[PDB]
Amino acid sequence: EQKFYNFVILHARADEHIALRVREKLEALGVPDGATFCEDFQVCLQDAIDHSAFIILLLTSNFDCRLSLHQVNQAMMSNLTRQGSPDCVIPFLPLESSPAQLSSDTASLLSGLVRLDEHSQIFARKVANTFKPHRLQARKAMWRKEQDTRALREQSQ
Amino acid sequence: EQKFYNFVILHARADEHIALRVREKLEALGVPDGATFCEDFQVCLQDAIDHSAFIILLLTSNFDCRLSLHQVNQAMMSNLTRQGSPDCVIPFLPLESSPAQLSSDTASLLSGLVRLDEHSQIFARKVANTFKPHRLQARKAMWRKEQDTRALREQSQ
Amino acid sequence: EQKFYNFVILHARADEHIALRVREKLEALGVPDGATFCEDFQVCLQDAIDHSAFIILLLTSNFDCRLSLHQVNQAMMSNLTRQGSPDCVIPFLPLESSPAQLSSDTASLLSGLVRLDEHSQIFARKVANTFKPHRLQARKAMWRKEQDTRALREQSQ
Amino acid sequence: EQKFYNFVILHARADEHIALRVREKLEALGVPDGATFCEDFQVCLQDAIDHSAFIILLLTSNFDCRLSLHQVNQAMMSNLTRQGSPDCVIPFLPLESSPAQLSSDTASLLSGLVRLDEHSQIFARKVANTFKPHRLQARKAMWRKEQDTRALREQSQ
Amino acid sequence: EQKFYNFVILHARADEHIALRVREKLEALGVPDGATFCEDFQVCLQDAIDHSAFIILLLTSNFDCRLSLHQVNQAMMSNLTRQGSPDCVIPFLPLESSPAQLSSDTASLLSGLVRLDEHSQIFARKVANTFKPHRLQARKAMWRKEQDTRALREQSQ
Amino acid sequence: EQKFYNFVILHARADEHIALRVREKLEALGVPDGATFCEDFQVCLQDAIDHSAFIILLLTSNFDCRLSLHQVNQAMMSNLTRQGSPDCVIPFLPLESSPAQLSSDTASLLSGLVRLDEHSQIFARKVANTFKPHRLQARKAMWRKEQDTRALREQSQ
**Alpha-carbon span C17 to F51, nearest angstrom:** 69
Alpha carbon B74 to chain centroid distance? 12
| Closest Cα in chain E, distance from residue B80 (Å) | 6
**Alpha-carbon span F75 to F73, nearest angstrom:** 5
User: Å resolution of this model?
Assistant: 3.5
The residue of E114, E116, E121 whose CB has the most chain F CBs within 10 angstroms, and thus the best one to mutate to test that interface, is: E114
Q: What is the DSSP string of E5-31?
A: EEEEEE--GGGHHHHHHHHHHHHHHT-
Strands (E), chain A: 5-10, 52-58, 90-93, 116-117
The DSSP element (H or E) to which F91 belongs, if any, is strand F90-93
Reference D4, options D141, D151, D135; nearest CA is: D141
In this complex, the residue of C86, C109, C112 whose CB is nearest that of residue B66 is: C86
Please answer yes or no on whether D66 and E73 come within 8 Å at the CB atom: no
**Residue-wise burial string across C23-46, b where 16 or more C-beta atoms lie within 10 A, e elsewhere:** bebbeeeebeebbbbeeebeeebb
| Closest Cα in chain C, distance from residue A84 (Å) | 9
- Chain B residues within 8 angstroms (CB to CB) of chain C: 44, 46, 50, 66-67, 69-70, 73-78, 81, 153
Please answer yes or no on whether E78 and B111 come within 8 Å at the CB atom: yes
Please answer yes or no on whether C153 and A112 come within 8 Å at the CB atom: no
Alpha carbon C97 to chain centroid distance? 18
List subunits contacting chain F, requiring 3 or more Cβ pairs under 8 Å. Answer: D, E
Nearest 5 degrees, angle CA E124-CA E129-CA E130?
A: 100
Query: Tell me, which fold does domain B5-156 have in CATH?
Result: Rossmann fold (3.40.50)
Please answer yes or no on whether E134 and F38 come within 8 Å at the CB atom: no
**Alpha-carbon span B9 to B23, nearest angstrom:** 8
Nearest 5 degrees, angle CA B75-CA B77-CA B82?
A: 90
Strand partners, E55: E8
Terminus-to-terminus CA distance in chain E, angstroms?
19
**Alpha-carbon span E84 to F155, nearest angstrom:** 14
Please answer yes or no on whether F66 and D73 come within 8 Å at the CB atom: no
Please answer yes or no on whether A80 and C73 come within 8 Å at the CB atom: no
In this complex, the residue of E87, E90, E129 whose CB is nearest that of residue F40 is: E129
- Which residue does chain D place closest to F70, by CA atoms? D112
List chain B domain ranges.
5-156
Residues in E closer than 8 angstroms to C87, CB to CB, are: 43
- Chain E residues within 8 angstroms (CB to CB) of chain F: 87, 90, 112, 114, 120, 122, 125-126, 129-130, 134
Strand partners, B90: B56
**Alpha-carbon span B111 to B68, nearest angstrom:** 16
Nearest 5 degrees, angle CA A80-CA A81-CA A87?
A: 30
| Closest Cα in chain B, distance from residue E147 (Å) | 13
| Closest Cα in chain D, distance from residue E157 (Å) | 32
Q: At what angle do helices B66-81 and E66-81 cross, to 10 degrees?
A: 140
The residue of C74, C78, C80, C89 whose CB has the most chain B CBs within 10 angstroms, and thus the best one to mutate to test that interface, is: C80
Please answer yes or no on whether C80 and B74 come within 8 Å at the CB atom: no
**Alpha-carbon span F128 to F120, nearest angstrom:** 14
Strand partners, B54: B7
3-state secondary structure (DSSP) of residue A3: coil
Reference D90, options D130, D63, D62, D129; nearest CA is: D130
